[PDB]
């Protein structure tokens, strides 16, 4: 069976309980995770150990908090007390875990299921070939010995409009923002980097990225996490918003793909 779970955010107990609910069995089952495995919840260390141990039974994409953790580890960015990352950063296997984490994809595609996953979704300004090329380029910098320099370069809110002519720092910044920070778009597809509200509370003319028809979403289903204020609701057919805010006191959501059946684990707070 195929299971898809939204943002775990260090909620190790809830993750394990939800996987026991569906009797997840590596080797017979595969798990997709929308990223943001770490921060906020108490168990980032155990979450990373377990997900890494799953090997080929898990298909992960990296989220914005996974990237922030990598930036802290590399000495690029400052640790925030509220993220509760110190046990993981001080663990004897931190190097092993974070070197594995930075090698994980930004984008997962399954052609037999016609299914695409990224942390924040697929910007309507991208077709599938471009999304794949951009994911490959950022994965290449993150997998390289020089990844601290990329992590430093990635910070920024511009440019917010895609063009195949983008080069260098602006290209990498847009790719990073589209995959891991996107929520709202302007009518022309341009990213808005500020509003994190639910679609009903957002200012005009902002619309959710998935409300703008795009070539990937016309052919593929898209699963994503990231957007907690969306609460997993309000999406069109073929769009699966899996982040129901477990770390925030919401729920951890798991979707079984074969029958589109949902399983929910309440947050423990
Ligand atoms: O800049 P981003 O990187 O896009 O977002 P973030 O605030 O830094 O964190 P995260 O990626 O985990 O997103 P989240 O929705 O959880 O966090 C974004 C904001 O959404 C808020 N939020 C979480 N759940 C919400 C809900 N159910 N309803 C309304 N707002 C909610 C949180 O206070 C948080 O500040
Ligand atoms: Mn996120
Ligand atoms: Mn998140």
From Swiss-Prot:
Catalytic activity: P(1),P(4)-bis(5'-adenosyl) tetraphosphate + H2O = 2 ADP + 2 H(+)
Domain of life: Bacteria
EC identifiers of the protein: 3.6.1.41
Signal peptide: none
GO biological process, one term: nucleobase-containing small molecule interconversion
Gene3D superfamilies xrefs: 3.60.21.10
GO molecular-function term, one example from the UniProt record: hydrolase activity
Record key words, sorted: Hydrolase
Recorded GO CC terms: cytoplasm
Pfam families xrefs: Metallophos
Activity control, per UniProt: Co(2+) is a strong stimulator (100-fold increase in rate of hydrolysis). Mn(2+), Cd(2+), Ni(2+), Mg(2+) and Ca(2+) are weak stimulators; the two latter act synergistically with Co(2+).
PANTHER family linked to this entry: CYTOCHROME C5, PTHR40942
Biological role: Hydrolyzes diadenosine 5',5'''-P1,P4-tetraphosphate to yield ADP.
Assembly notes: Monomer.
UniProt similarity note: Belongs to the Ap4A hydrolase family.
Database matches in HAMAP family: ApaH (MF_00199)
Record-given protein name: Bis(5'-nucleosyl)-tetraphosphatase [symmetrical]
Species: Escherichia coli (strain K12)
Gene: apaH
């Amino acid at each position: 069976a195929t299971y898809l779970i939204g943002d775990v955010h260090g909620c190790y107990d809830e993750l394990i309980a939800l996987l026991h609910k569906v009797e997840f069995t590596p080797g017979k089952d595969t798990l997709w995770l929308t990223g943001d495995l770490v921060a906020r919840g108490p168990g980032s260390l155990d979450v990373l150990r377990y997900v890494k141990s799953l090997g080929d039974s898990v298909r992960l994409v990296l989220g914005n908090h996974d990237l922030h953790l990598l930036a802290v580890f590399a000495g690029i960015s400052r640790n925030k007390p509220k993220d509760r990352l110190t046990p993981l950063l001080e663990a004897p296997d931190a190097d092993e875990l974070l070197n594995w984490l930075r090698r994980q994809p930004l984008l997962q595609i399954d052609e037999e299921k016609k299914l695409v996953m990224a942390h924040a979704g697929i910007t309507p300004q991208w077709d599938l070939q471009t999304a794949k090329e951009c994911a490959r380029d950022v994965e290449a910098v993150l997998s390289s010995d020089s990844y601290p320099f990329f992590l430093d370069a990635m910070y920024g809110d511009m440019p917010n409009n895609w063009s195949p002519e983008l080069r260098g720092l602006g290209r990498l910044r847009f790719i990073t923002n589209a995959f891991t920070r996107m929520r709202f778009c302007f009518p022309n597809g341009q990213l808005d980097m500020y509003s994190k509200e639910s679609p009903e509370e957002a200012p005009a003319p902002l619309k959710p990225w998935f409300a703008i028809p795009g070539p990937v979403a016309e052919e593929y289903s898209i699963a994503f996490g990231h957007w907690a204020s969306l609460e997993g609701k309000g999406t069109p057919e073929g769009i699966y918003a899996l982040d129901t805010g477990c770390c925030w006191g919401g729920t951890l959501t798991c979707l079984r793909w074969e029958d589109k059946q949902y399983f929910v684990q309440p947050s423990n707070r």
